[PDB]
Design a protein around this ligand. Sequence first.
Ligand code: 5RW
Ligand code: 5RW
Ligand code: 5RW
Ligand code: 5RW
Ligand code: 5RW
Ligand code: 5RW
Ligand code: 5RW
Ligand code: 5RW
Ligand code: NA
Ligand code: NA
Ligand code: NA
Ligand code: NA
Ligand code: NA
Ligand code: ZN
Ligand code: ZN
Ligand code: ZN
Ligand code: ZN
Ligand code: ZN
Ligand code: ZN
Ligand code: ZN
Ligand code: ZN
Lengths: 167, 180, 182, 179, 188, 188, 167, 180, 84, 86, 86, 84, 87
Amino acid sequence: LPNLAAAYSSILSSLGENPQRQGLLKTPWRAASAMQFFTKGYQETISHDEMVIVKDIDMFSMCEHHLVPFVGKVHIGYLPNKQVLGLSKLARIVEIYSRRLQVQERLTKQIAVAITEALRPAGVGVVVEATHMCMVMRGNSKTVTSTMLGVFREDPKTREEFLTLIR
Amino acid sequence: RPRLNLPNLAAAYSSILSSLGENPQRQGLLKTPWRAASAMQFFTKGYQETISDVLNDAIFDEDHDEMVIVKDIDMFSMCEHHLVPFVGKVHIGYLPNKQVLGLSKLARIVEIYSRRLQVQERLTKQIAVAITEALRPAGVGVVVEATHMCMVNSKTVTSTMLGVFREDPKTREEFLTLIR
Amino acid sequence: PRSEEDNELNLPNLAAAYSSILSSLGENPQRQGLLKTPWRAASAMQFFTKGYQETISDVLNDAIFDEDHDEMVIVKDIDMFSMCEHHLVPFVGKVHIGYLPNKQVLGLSKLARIVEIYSRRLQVQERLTKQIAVAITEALRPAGVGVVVEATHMCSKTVTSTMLGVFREDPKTREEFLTLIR
Amino acid sequence: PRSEEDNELNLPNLAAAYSSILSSLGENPQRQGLLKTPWRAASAMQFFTKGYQETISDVHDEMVIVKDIDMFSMCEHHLVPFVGKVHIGYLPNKQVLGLSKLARIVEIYSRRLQVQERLTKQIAVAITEALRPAGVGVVVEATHMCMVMRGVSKTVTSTMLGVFREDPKTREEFLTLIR
Amino acid sequence: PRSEEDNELNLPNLAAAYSSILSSLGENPQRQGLLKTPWRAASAMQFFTKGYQETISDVLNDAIFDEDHDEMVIVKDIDMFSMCEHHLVPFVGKVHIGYLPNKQVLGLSKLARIVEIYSRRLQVQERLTKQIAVAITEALRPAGVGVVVEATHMCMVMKMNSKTVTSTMLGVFREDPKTREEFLTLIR
Amino acid sequence: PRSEEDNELNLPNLAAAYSSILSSLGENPQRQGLLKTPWRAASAMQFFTKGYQETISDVLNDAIFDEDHDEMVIVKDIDMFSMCEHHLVPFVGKVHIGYLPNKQVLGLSKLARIVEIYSRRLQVQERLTKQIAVAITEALRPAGVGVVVEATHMCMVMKMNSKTVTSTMLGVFREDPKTREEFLTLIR
Amino acid sequence: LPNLAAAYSSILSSLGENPQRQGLLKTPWRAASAMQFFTKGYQETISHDEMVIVKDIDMFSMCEHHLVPFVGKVHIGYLPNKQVLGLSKLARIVEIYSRRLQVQERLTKQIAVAITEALRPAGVGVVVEATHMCMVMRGNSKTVTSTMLGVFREDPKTREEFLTLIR
Amino acid sequence: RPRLNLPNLAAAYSSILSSLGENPQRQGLLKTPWRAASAMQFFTKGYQETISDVLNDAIFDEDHDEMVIVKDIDMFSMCEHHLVPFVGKVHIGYLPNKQVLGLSKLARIVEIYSRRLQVQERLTKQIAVAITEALRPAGVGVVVEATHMCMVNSKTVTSTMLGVFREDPKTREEFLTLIR
Amino acid sequence: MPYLLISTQIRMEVGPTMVGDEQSDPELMQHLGASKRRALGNNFYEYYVDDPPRIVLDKLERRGFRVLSMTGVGQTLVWCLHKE
Amino acid sequence: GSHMPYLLISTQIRMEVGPTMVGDEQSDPELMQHLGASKRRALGNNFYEYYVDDPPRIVLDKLERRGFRVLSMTGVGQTLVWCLHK
Amino acid sequence: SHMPYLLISTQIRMEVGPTMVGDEQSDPELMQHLGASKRRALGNNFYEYYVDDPPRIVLDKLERRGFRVLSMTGVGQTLVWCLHKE
Amino acid sequence: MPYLLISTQIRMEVGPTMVGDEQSDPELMQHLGASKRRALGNNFYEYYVDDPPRIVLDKLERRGFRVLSMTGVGQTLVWCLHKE
Amino acid sequence: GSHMPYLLISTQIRMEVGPTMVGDEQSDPELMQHLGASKRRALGNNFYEYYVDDPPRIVLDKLERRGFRVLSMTGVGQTLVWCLHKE
Ligand SMILES: Nc1nc2nc(SCc3ccc(F)cc3)[nH]c2c(=O)[nH]1
Ligand SMILES: Nc1nc2nc(SCc3ccc(F)cc3)[nH]c2c(=O)[nH]1
Ligand SMILES: Nc1nc2nc(SCc3ccc(F)cc3)[nH]c2c(=O)[nH]1
Ligand SMILES: Nc1nc2nc(SCc3ccc(F)cc3)[nH]c2c(=O)[nH]1
Ligand SMILES: Nc1nc2nc(SCc3ccc(F)cc3)[nH]c2c(=O)[nH]1
Ligand SMILES: Nc1nc2nc(SCc3ccc(F)cc3)[nH]c2c(=O)[nH]1
Ligand SMILES: Nc1nc2nc(SCc3ccc(F)cc3)[nH]c2c(=O)[nH]1
Ligand SMILES: Nc1nc2nc(SCc3ccc(F)cc3)[nH]c2c(=O)[nH]1
Ligand code: NA
Ligand code: NA
Ligand code: NA
Ligand code: NA
Ligand code: NA
Ligand SMILES: [Zn+2]
Ligand SMILES: [Zn+2]
Ligand SMILES: [Zn+2]
Ligand SMILES: [Zn+2]
Ligand SMILES: [Zn+2]
Ligand SMILES: [Zn+2]
Ligand SMILES: [Zn+2]
Ligand SMILES: [Zn+2]
């Protein structure tokens, strides 16, 4: 934490700003605590015959290339074999991987792999839709990444069903 | 005076990468100290400009008795408390007296103040004050709508109404209807 | 099934438990706003679980019609209010039902009555979706059934989907149902 | 305020009441899906009322608005949730509130057994007393489950104080900007 | 006013300037896609400025009708295409016109013809808005006129989401709050 | 490629041609609003064609990442501003790009930089669409690429409501019905 | 009718079309009967304390200048004094005046005048929204005409209420 | 041969005014015989053009392997049964072989056939046949959506799918998704 | 008949000026050059003149009237006169 | 001076037509009877009022004969109010 | 004269109170005579004196204290009277 | 010509002040330094001065006028003066 | 009569509280000083004004002691305006 605050104080000076003015006095510490909270996922470990979908799961992540947030939604689908996952646990999986320095592609894969390994289902579908500040604050575009595994990859009926139902 | 420091910024971002528990040497993190430093310089490039520079070839003497609005101006700023972006839109309206401003210059005004470490309230005021002082118009309306990433669905709306935009109910209603 | 006699008999026990809950939460059960709450919460929880007082056979009374139609029949946007069996907090939304009849059709309102008896119980969305589809399949022996439940859980949206018979097998049938339920 | 010790102490009494409710409804509290329900329902009801653990003390000439603040509250009449959004506006005199602090005001009062009217008033009164501004506007929009799980609709409550009450231009501006 | 003879005479000079521009940009004016460009760009720029060929007097020939109508008349969503006089890039959008007549009404299509004469020139949105309102006020002497222009300027987009709205309110549209509110509600 | 020296050298020739156009149209190049127009129009036309100053090689410097990702990657609603090569009037809209990688992924911003190099030229929408798809296919050798451009042509509007959509589907986006359907659903 | 069919047959010849081809043989009679139906209004004669509104009344009329249709909707509002008008009669008033060669301004006035004279109310509001083919088939624009009488003209609260409720 | 008659048209419209029971001499009806005649000539100006005239400077030899669509082309036609307009939109798509058509020329094709006394089915076919014959493409899709004033809310949609637009499910699905 | 009410809408520089109701003195209305009408949407008759209110006020002064009060209500300027 | 010296009367625009509000619950009943006024509690109001069908000019002339004079006239919303004194 | 001016007000409807009769610096004896109470209404950063009576009753009381209405006006939904010791 | 109507829009501290209509006394208009114009959108001429109303009121007092009434109507402050 | 006979003062509602606007740029500086007024050009205005923190009732009593009398009081928008005169 003090090393993070020292680096943020250095950034405040290098930008041409006065780190002694009222509004900036506590900024080195607030920015350091914020960056620790945005990466709190490094503190955690991953340890019926119907399509189950949890859509519009809010997602907040940090771009590893520019250290600017990318925010959006995750839509998850799966066709269980024997065991089903508790609805709140799907969002907890989203949380562990998104609260880290990421690239949307790796984040999407990590969620799908975690669900596939926890349940061994007939299929999984993971779609992430996000706005990257590293692209917006530079110059309306959205990034969509999609992982389709098992029957979600193989069966056209299954994939079409998932994609229609997540709208 | 308005705004060498790029290596100092890159060094601080490299330090941050290490302090977070991340390995700065992995493929995806190798050029990050420089990319984050260039991004933070671009986000604060408003400190490199003055309101006088923006007003070059911007004023036109004209007999226009009409409300002039530039709405949905994209706005990207940086929270001065947490160094996390706040993004949204600015809607500006004014009723000229004897001078009009080039339409693109209104956006350039938004750009100079928003590209800094800010609080939405100060940003809103700075835009309205710059227009008021550049043109001495009968009235000004500035509305900023933004999402603050430090809060991580809720939106903040700040609104400055000056001159006839404050005093005349017809003028304020007209501006607020036309910006929708 | 649960009877109206069981309800009258258990209403004071339910009210007593809700009065206990108000006290255990740190609240004052004697203030104006909470005075009648033990009884109102008890009557509400009985109404939310009123599905236990009805059987699928009662629903099927005057519900079946012998018809030769050969068309997809859909009832969409059926309001659904259920109770989460894990936390006792509501999950609410909509059910969309489709079927391709063989020789029998159901009265359109009876499809809603099926959603009613299963959703008005302590439930998990997956079991609720299956119970509706199984009840329609067993009552009509149709060529296929599609059941889609979309709900918000008070404890993001959960969508569960059962595709049976030709709704599972035929890509044209499944696509038609999913397009028409928009 | 309610303490975390009070919560630990009352959790078994809450679980016992929820186990009683499961048996009084005609259900089987011993079946797999209902076994942990008395303790999950008790912990959920404590979380829904965590605002009793807080006190308000612990937490420019322009209109300041924070709109679409998510709100979850509990009906005190029926013990079923009412959920929606809060839109807050104010015209400061000499002191302003930190943007996150008003979400914290909505949180303390909404996470309790409530009636929407009292909740709307409590938020407006807290902002008015904390800041003593020229005016405040508080609009709450909610769906009540005790009205939807029985035949029928949204409830909108609106408190307008100071210049938000007196000036037609101010009130119109706030109502337009919260859309 | 500009005549069709002036157009024929200046077409080769316009094509020559566009051929010069193609060369000065680093492009090959001999490639398939650029071959006729000097002439197509010149004819397009003449069409975009065809408003200089018309007068407000000829546009209003038998456009006036003497009638006893006490009602607000609005023509909304009139497509508008103009050219920025500063950058020579288009600005495009819509015009919404309202008026409260007294002794005379204008043919509904003639209001669009007024938008055409002024927009088909090298313009600034503020001047265009005023010219339309002044032409209606002078042609009819009404109790009031409202003119609202909404446009996207390509010299501002090339920021991208921004629109320019200009609004002229005269007579009772300026003075009466009920009249102005009615017009602004009915155009949306 | 075009250099900044070529731009400085040709700026007066561009301004001279724009001054000539102002005179040939029947306008007064001495009025307040037209005074600096020859220079502003010339600088604008240079900016609109800045893509001739870049190469696909420099745009893709350290844009490639070797990764084992088996997922569809899409960047949708990329704002696009181009210039019609036939009429010298803008065509504007959006680009939606999709690809299924194998051994390499491209930095998300680099896909937009590819749209920039080709769109900032005198173009036809069909060529622009192909150039973007070919650049992605050659830079990554992926299993498939999809490129959809949606635009409004000012030389068609000046009919007014019409949009042009061009679509390139390569590799698995062409061959697999599930892949193509997935991309088309996810971009809307 | 035969005089109308003779004129339509003449128009078919003057346009450069063959009035003897299969698709055009019955056109002089069909166009004549259509034009009589479009002007059937010439065959007819006009002979509580709450705001009453009937909105989205479909309207089909004929431009008197170009003989091309103008179509849209009528929204009517009134504040009764003593007597109220049957809901279906408001649409019958719309029908008599719209089924004629018209100008939207005259049509709007005729409806408002008919309601004012039939009920003597505290106020009437009539708004007509229409697309004119004489303007569309030449080169998105809509014409809106609005008559506000009595308290709908005088009271800002009343006029605002009517205009909000017709949306 | 493709398309003097204006006074004959005005005389017929003057006759119609009288036969309807209306007084042709009132202020609003005075210039109507000429305005209606000029309008009916403009609505049928498609008889003055040939498909060959439209194809001047329209063809481009190019190696483009992509679907080309021009959607929301405004369309105004006249019903040949009642002489009342039918209006709407045309959406065209094609997959070129070795030649592409200038984007505006697709709209000019719609214009020549729709500006005539028509039936929507014939109009749809004429547009598709003209594109097929001008370019010999791998496939064509033409969708016309219109409101018929003779019927006085219901819409008529006609759709022609040729070549690969008819045969390939992927091609037809792509066209139908992209025209929305 | 000691009291008189007259009015005009903004702008005050221009008429019409309303100078009476159905029960107004017909001789005074005739003197002012007023006409009687029932405007569309009204269920009452009124007397009006084309003159702006300043001209009507001067005429009423010559008839022995004096302005007691002037007020705005909506867009209407109203004068209350008393015969002195 | 006099017993009950002030009087407030009002009308909504148009001023040429009634009703004219001439009193509250505590108004002088004899003066209300003289004006031909009726007492009512209009729906939505939590108070009684006295009103007449006459336009305000007629009420003003009657009040003049009772010794009242107009001190002030004002507009508030759509209401014209007269303040009279005896 | 000492404290010659007085401002009083009521919202529409004029037939009913409350009537605002003073600010923090108002004469306490006159406020007591009118039966007024002092309060700081929620949303206001000032104290006011008010009575439940409609303005006609307050006007008659002020007349007996030597005050005369100089002017009456409307502002928004408020009717205001300006009185002077006369 | 005993009556006079003058006006200003809010804010009252600043002009223009409207001081007359087409039929106003030209000598009084000249005395006030007024100019005649037909503002765009108006179908009537008006006389106005740049002065705020307090200055016009003092000038009218020296011409024998006295304010009888002052009122607001929309955004306009109007004064009714009489030659007394 | 007197030099500078008319005076315009104003307040926004609520009337119980100030500021009270008491003058324009050309106002008598001695009277402004007597009222304890300050001169400012509020942001958005292209003119100077004199104002006091006092509610209008207090300013009216002060003006009475200077020989002014209220001739008229009116509302305009949210503003209460008083027109005063001195002989
Ligand atoms: N709703 C819904 N339910 C579904 N259940 C299935 S089992 C298919 C299967 C396919 C291949 C295989 F080797 C084993 C099992 N598929 C479904 C579907 O596509 N939709
Ligand atoms: N569109 C539009 N145009 C407008 N022009 C104005 S000038 C105000 C003004 C100027 C000078 C003056 F003395 C009094 C009032 N106000 C407008 C408005 O509210 N809308
Ligand atoms: N509308 C509509 N009607 C339908 N009727 C049937 S008969 C069953 C059947 C049997 C074999 C087979 F291969 C496909 C379908 N299926 C329908 C359908 O999918 N849609
Ligand atoms: N945007 C916006 N800004 C605004 N500032 C005000 S200050 C009113 C006021 C407050 C206190 C006082 F003593 C005098 C005037 N009102 C505003 C408004 O309605 N909108
Ligand atoms: N629809 C509509 N019609 C209107 N006609 C007028 S005439 C000016 C005027 C004259 C007399 C009067 F009592 C009120 C208004 N104003 C209108 C308006 O604002 N809207
Ligand atoms: N989301 C998404 N991911 C995808 N990855 C592929 S690899 C080609 C392939 C390989 C093996 C296989 F069995 C099926 C498809 N295709 C995809 C796709 O169409 N969508
Ligand atoms: N809903 C609704 N009902 C309403 N009833 C009225 S009676 C007004 C009135 C106003 C002036 C007058 F001379 C006589 C009567 N006004 C209403 C309104 O504006 N809305
Ligand atoms: N975007 C898009 N481009 C496409 N190009 C084609 S070539 C068809 C073809 C050509 C030759 C052949 F031997 C077999 C198939 N089909 C496409 C498509 O469906 N969509
Ligand atoms: Na007037
Ligand atoms: Na009245
Ligand atoms: Na009151
Ligand atoms: Na003024
Ligand atoms: Na005040
Ligand atoms: Zn990035
Ligand atoms: Zn922050
Ligand atoms: Zn649960
Ligand atoms: Zn409840
Ligand atoms: Zn420009
Ligand atoms: Zn082109
Ligand atoms: Zn027409
Ligand atoms: Zn037909």
